[PDB]
């Protein structure tokens, strides 16, 4: 990787890592890694979650629980040890509680597990919250890309890893092969109001 650049001067490169530091103090700060365009990951402490963006919608607003209070949002958590990671991700994406549209959730009794769903479609009554959520994911996740289509239907999904909603992707598979990006954490711990949020 080093080639001669002059007579005695030589081109050299060094590669640094911060993923160890992300794990070193894994508490009070998650580690974010993006698998590809439609898949994203989040690891908080000893619990890892999956962030999915796509047009599918397995969860409905009619006969399912909807989340309003910032304290009772633990319904989509089968192992309800702590939903602090989900809460901190939600209020770091720019989402609000006082006057912001709510998000869907699923009963913990069902085997599907956590199925936190957001509505980010570019349509009527959805261009105020969806754009803000996508800006939040742009600021947190480095290489975020929009998979939705203008004037069509598109959603967002958050699922704890190990649940059927996360499928076999989680476990010792995707999160293991995913590399935590420290720029995500650096953008994630700064509160200057000058960012995209």
């Amino acid at each position: 990787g080093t080639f001669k650049i002059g007579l005695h001067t030589e081109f050299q490169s060094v590669t640094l890592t911060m993923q160890r530091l992300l794990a070193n103090h894994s508490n009070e700060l998650p580690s974010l890694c993006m698998l590809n365009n439609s898949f994203y990951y989040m690891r908080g402490g000893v619990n890892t979650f999956l962030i999915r963006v796509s047009d599918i919608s397995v969860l409905m607003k009619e006969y399912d629980v909807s989340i309003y209070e910032p304290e009772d949002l633990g319904n989509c958590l089968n192992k309800s040890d702590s939903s602090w990671a989900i809460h901190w991700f939600s209020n770091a994406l720019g989402h609000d509680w006082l006057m912001d549209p709510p998000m869907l959730c699923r009963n913990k009794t069902k085997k599907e597990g956590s199925n936190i769903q957001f509505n980010i479609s570019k349509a009527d009554d959805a261009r105020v919250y969806g754009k803000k959520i996508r800006n939040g994911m742009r600021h947190l996740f480095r290489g975020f890309h929009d998979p939705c289509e203008e004037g069509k239907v598109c959603y967002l999904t958050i699922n704890q890893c190990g649940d059927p909603s996360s499928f076999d992707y989680c476990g010792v598979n995707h999160l293991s092969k995913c590399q935590f990006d420290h720029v995500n954490t650096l953008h994630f711990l700064v509160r200057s109001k000058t960012h995209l949020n």
Binding site: E10, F11, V14, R142, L186
Partner: protein, 217 residues
């Protein structure tokens, strides 16, 4: 100088950077490598002292991340990424190292476009100018050290003394006349004649006769 242990590098062992190159980070706030070094130093300091006590209910780690890291640089990199132009993701840094002297430049980002590292042909001018600047800095550091210890007045004194000595040598070769000789007469020594050719002794009358100049004989 500044050294990075093995756990902070990928596929490499512990390596050390020169103090002078790291000293460029004292006032630098538009450099990503300086920010990474600051984060590493803060981690090393926190683990050494703050981690020992179980009072870690206070988030000085975050209060430093938003303080010792220039958020302007992060947001500029994010804007560059959103414009689909090369940006820095704080992973790989490149620099120019002088193999003999062992002193190098401040590492610069290996920019990434389309999620891939740029080949060493798009920023060829960047590392060419980096090598040129390294050579210039190596040559100018010696001048700075010389100027910090050798007075300008002493150099001026030496230069003017050399000019005086050279002029003295020139006057030694060419020779300067020592006394006047009357036209058509012999050497008027030991008497001294003025422009009029006379003298106070009275031997030479003041006839205002022309006189010439002769060197030592």
């Amino acid at each position: 100088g500044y050294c990075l242990e093995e756990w902070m590098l990928i596929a490499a062992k512990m390596k050390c950077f020169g103090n002078t190159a790291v000293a460029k980070c004292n006032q630098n706030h538009d450099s990503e490598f300086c920010d990474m070094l600051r984060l590493f130093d803060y981690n090393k300091n926190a683990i050494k002292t703050l981690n020992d006590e179980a009072k870690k209910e206070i988030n000085l780690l975050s209060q430093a991340v938003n303080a010792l890291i220039s958020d302007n640089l992060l947001m500029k990199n994010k804007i560059k990424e959103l414009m689909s132009i090369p940006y820095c993701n704080y992973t790989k840094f490149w620099y120019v190292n002088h193999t003999l002297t062992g002193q190098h430049t401040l590492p610069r980002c290996w920019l990434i476009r389309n999620g891939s590292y740029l080949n060493t042909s798009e920023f060829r001018n960047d590392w060419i100018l980096e090598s040129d600047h390294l050579i210039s800095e190596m040559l100018s550091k010696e001048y700075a050290e010389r100027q910090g210890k050798t007075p300008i007045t002493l150099v001026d004194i030496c230069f003017w003394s050399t000019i005086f000595f050279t002029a003295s040598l020139f006057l030694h070769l060419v020779g300067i006349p020592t006394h006047r000789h009357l036209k058509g007469e012999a050497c008027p020594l030991p008497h001294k004649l003025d422009s009029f050719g006379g003298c106070r002794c009275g031997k030479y009358p003041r006839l205002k006769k022309p006189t010439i100049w002769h060197k030592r004989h």
